[PDB]
């Protein structure tokens, strides 16, 4: 009988992995230690929901992936998409959290970063399909993900973003989608894609996973002819500015759906101008902090570690309101931008950083609560 | 050498008599008087047919029927289904429009009103088959018809509909599926089944036939005993909004059908907010125009006379997308609603209003042409 009456899906973001996919000593994403987001929500009797999508995937990738881990059924990227980049059509098979999803029943969506953006494009698919996907069907017929077809609307009550780099990050493109550090993360997937792997990276349909007779040296060999050495199909690049900017320009606002963003500084002014990473920001988003901060353009520096506050905000070419923190945020078909959460950096949002007593764990359970409760107002208007 | 490469199938409404079946009085059903479908559009040289199947009988039954219709045989509803509502299995035996009918060589499906149920549902048979029938054959072995069997496909081109009522009409609901008003059609239909009784309204299988040496009263004593008086295996339900939202729950978009409807308005906008019948609409349908425009959910409201426009368009929970009226209608797997017709009534569409000079016989011809262009267009694509 559960107090909300669409249910909530959390989407994780660039490196996530839930559940059971998330090795034992990586921390547990959706509140680490500070609020267990997922089994808390429940106890206090909302219908609430933890996606696990591709970790080092594209956007579309991801997108895909969503719409099937809450639909049921097998992971098809479409056959042009699939030939275009080089990787596999066919994915996972997920069991689905709602088999009977289609309009009329609705769904609440929450993205922590990357997550923001994958939770946009899905919609778009369901919305407006994808062109081409439909002509490549019209011209080849066989099998269409509906995901791809269009015209399904009233399924998304609500997209809610917590920062969501909607502008990129030039941690993206000065770190990160370097040749350099992709090398690095795509020998990482192809370790983890090894016969006895218990984990998965988010990458097995360019390849990265060992056949069951078939050589460490043999795999290696195979899967170094993959595409994904070089392509732009995969997270590194649709984070970059140029990769977000692309998602901005084709995607719209649902007249219909309730949008809301938060956004966390981490970061504090230089004599100079410039922008450097607070004590408490998580030691790991130090360097990204700082080649934010450093930016020749004085907007782009403010930073909550890893993606900058002009990016976290609202998508720029589409429209917002800023909203105060208490009034109900239940305007449909533009973006309520909240105020920036002072002190709190990119992984504060989901309680990971066991380092910063600052954050405690009931102003996380607050934070949360506080989102529920604004799910609850879009429910309560329509 | 038929112009149109797949037949064309025309399937009649809720209260629909074609043919011989039509008693003298009776309006010839496709086009009236304004414009004579079947006979001008094989004179223009289409290959077009006028499905015959039950009047007032549910649009599980004429699913079946119109499979026969359309195969050749002896109707059978399914030993499952005839037990569980207390009909006969077996009912009339069609000589069928195309004996040869099987994957690879399609129809076209136009229907009008409930016609456009009926179509979605046999379709939904073919493709998927009857779980009820399937389990049961499982069980007690005998026979079973193909219909009921899944796993045919290409059977159908194109998928039409005219005025349908796809989310029901409250017009059944408030009147209609009454307990008054289905006594009454029961009684029709009792006295239509009299030994001396030239025409056949669809509820033989529920007992509607007196037999030869079978007095009147002993006749009514029999079938007064038929579950058809309590049952809602009848049309009067299936057109309520519960009815139609079953059939909606467990049809769904085939891939590669094309899908198209239209829709009428014939009400105008009260000073009150509610919405009443245009001078034009047909009498009969003056009573039902007024019970649907003065819903208390003000989006129910605007209708052709006997269904609501938010009916007509599309089955609410299933994929749409609204179309110019010029424009080639050739997209796959969702519903291509055509722009509403302005001051045309539910009937004004088969042309049977002989009182709407203002509804011209030219004008019904390029309608249905216009139809015939769109399946030729569907036929040159794929
Ligand atoms: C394996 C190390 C890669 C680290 C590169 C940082 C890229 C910044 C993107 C931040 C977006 C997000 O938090 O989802
Ligand atoms: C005996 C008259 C009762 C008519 C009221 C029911 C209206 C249902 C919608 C019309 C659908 C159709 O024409 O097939
Ligand atoms: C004018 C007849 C007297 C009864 C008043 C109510 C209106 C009756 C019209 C019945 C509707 C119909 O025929 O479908
Ligand atoms: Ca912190
Ligand atoms: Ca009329
Ligand atoms: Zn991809
Ligand atoms: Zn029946």
Chains 1, 2 share one sequence.
Not at 24 to 29: D, R, S
Not at 352 to 373: H, M, P, Q, T, W
Request: glycine share 10%; net charge neutral; proline share 4%.
């Amino acid at each position: 009988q559960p107090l909300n009456k669409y249910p909530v899906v959390f989407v994780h973001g660039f490196l996530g992995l839930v559940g059971d996919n998330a090795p034992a000593l990586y921390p547990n994403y959706w509140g680490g230690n500070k609020f267990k987001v997922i089994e808390e929500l429940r106890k206090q009797g909302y219908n609430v929901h933890q996606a696990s999508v591709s970790a080092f995937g594209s956007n579309y990738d991801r997108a895909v992936q969503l719409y099937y881990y809450i639909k049921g059924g097998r992971v098809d990227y479409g056959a042009a998409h699939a030939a275009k980049y080089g990787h596999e059509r066919y994915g996972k098979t997920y069991k689905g959290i709602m088999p009977n999803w289609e309009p009329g029943k609705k769904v609440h969506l929450v993205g922590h970063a990357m997550g923001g953006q994958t939770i946009r494009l899905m919609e778009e698919f369901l919305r407006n399909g994808n062109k081409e996907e439909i002509a490549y069907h019209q011209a080849h017929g066989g099998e269409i993900s509906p995901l791809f077809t269009g015209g399904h609307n009233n399924m998304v009550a609500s997209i809610t973003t917590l920062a969501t780099p909607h502008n990129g990050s030039q941690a993206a493109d000065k770190f990160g989608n370097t040749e350099a550090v992709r090398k690095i993360m795509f020998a990482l997937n192809r370790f983890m894609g090894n016969k006895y792997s218990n984990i998965d990276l988010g990458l097995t349909q360019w390849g990265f996973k060992q056949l069951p007779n078939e050589s460490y040296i043999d795999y290696i060999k195979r899967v170094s002819k993959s595409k994904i050495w070089t392509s732009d199909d995969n997270a590194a690049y649709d984070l970059t500015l140029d990769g977000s900017a692309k998602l901005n320009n084709m995607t719209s606002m649902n007249p219909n759906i309730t949008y809301t963003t938060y956004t966390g500084v981490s970061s504090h002014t230089g004599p100079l101008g410039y922008e450097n990473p607070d004590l408490g920001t998580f030691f790991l988003m130090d360097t990204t902090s700082r080649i934010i901060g450093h930016d020749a353009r004085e907007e782009w520096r403010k930073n909550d570690g890893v993606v900058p506050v002009i990016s976290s905000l609202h998508p720029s070419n589409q429209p917002f309101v800023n909203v105060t923190n208490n009034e109900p945020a239940t305007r449909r078909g533009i973006w309520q931008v909240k105020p920036i959460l002072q002190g709190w950096d990119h992984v504060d949002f989901i309680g990971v950083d066991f380092l910063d007593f600052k954050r405690k764990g009931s102003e996380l359970a607050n934070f949360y609560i506080g989102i529920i409760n604004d799910l609850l107002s879009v429910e309560a208007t329509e």
